[PDB]
Design a protein around this ligand. Structure first.
Ligand SMILES: Nc1ncnc2c1ncn2[C@@H]1O[C@H](COP(=O)(O)O)[C@@H](O)[C@H]1O
Ligand SMILES: Nc1ncnc2c1ncn2[C@@H]1O[C@H](COP(=O)(O)O)[C@@H](O)[C@H]1O
Ligand SMILES: Nc1ncnc2c1ncn2[C@@H]1O[C@H](COP(=O)(O)O)[C@@H](O)[C@H]1O
Ligand SMILES: [Mg+2]
Ligand SMILES: [Mg+2]
Ligand SMILES: [Mg+2]
Ligand SMILES: [Mg+2]
Lengths: 158, 160
């Protein structure tokens, strides 16, 4: 049913070039990958500072082509499976576009992937902004961030 | 406080090329603009059939440059006024990026404009999936669509 995701990327007002994506399922399963296809030379100061140094070493099998990440997510999200799929992120408009663009134009998204991502900050506000734990030390690592979103959701819906 | 918006665009898996944007305020004010900068020749069949035919005539003042649209939104949203801005759309990921891209990168969004758009489809489910009126005939006209979102918002929230 529910997946919580977050991405890092280099975005210049025109494209969103995926660096990494973390996805964590309410059931416990976790997926993380880093694209071998973004150009680190195109990163701005902020991304160079906060994002790139947290990436796995270059030898890690966590580094994957975009075709591999798409295929990995079709499996991970169980797109062919029995359960309905619900995607969640925090303040995730660009995250949703980054995800969908692994498949192409919005058209190309598998029939069972939702055409919207539920906005965890909206749920949080709707429930009176209950106290959340402080942000993890390793923010801007997309798996750490994705994990933190499931944590928040569990707390909010507790 | 609250603004309801919709956008039309040509999206290709790489970029989102803005066609038009409609914004309606809770107070009754309305804004609509069609960009002079997108290339209608890229549009696919669906956009050609459902979007382009609804655009104003060539000489309408509704046609504006992207820089003028940004300027018009800074004023329309009252970005220097004291109200906090809340933006809402229905199934609004691409709309939010299209809106925010009138300022360029994330970096450049005026600090008073929220970094997220509230998802009206998400609020609808949360409030028990109330039966809604049908969508208007003239859907795919961004101002029509924006107006209809403020309408559904008022109906969804009427006993909150
Ligand atoms: N303060 C910021 N300055 C510049 N880019 C940012 C900033 N916050 C977020 N981003 C961009 O948004 C992506 C997702 O952000 P996050 O999930 O906060 O790490 C980052 O990889 C950057 O491209
Ligand atoms: N059924 C569809 N097929 C192809 N593109 C679509 C479809 N629905 C929406 N779009 C795209 O999404 C934009 C906004 O959709 P809307 O707000 O429904 O009028 C359009 O301007 C198109 O680029
Ligand atoms: N200008 C922006 N437009 C959209 N999303 C943004 C922008 N700047 C930052 N974000 C996102 O906001 C997330 C953090 O939200 P929050 O901690 O509630 O401020 C970041 O991880 C980014 O992914
Ligand atoms: Mg994030
Ligand atoms: Mg590839
Ligand atoms: Mg992150
Ligand atoms: Mg729309």
């Amino acid at each position: 049913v529910r997946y919580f995701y977050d991405t890092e990327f280099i975005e210049d007002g025109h494209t969103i070039e995926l660096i990494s994506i973390g996805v964590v399922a309410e059931d416990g399963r976790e997926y993380y990958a880093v694209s071998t296809e973004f150009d680190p030379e195109r990163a701005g100061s902020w991304v160079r500072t906060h994002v790139l140094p947290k990436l796995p070493p270059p030898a890690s099998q966590l580094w994957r082509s975009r075709q591999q990440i798409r295929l990995d997510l079709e499996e991970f999200l169980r797109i062919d499976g029995t359960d309905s799929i619900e995607l969640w992120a925090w303040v995730g408009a660009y995250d949703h576009v980054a995800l969908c663009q692994l498949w192409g134009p919005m058209t190309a998204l598998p029939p069972t992937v939702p055409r919207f991502t539920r906005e965890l900050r909206q749920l949080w506000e709707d429930r009176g902004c209950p106290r959340m734990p402080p942000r993890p030390r390793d923010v801007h690592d997309a798996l750490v961030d994705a994990r933190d979103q499931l944590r928040r959701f569990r707390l909010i819906t507790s």
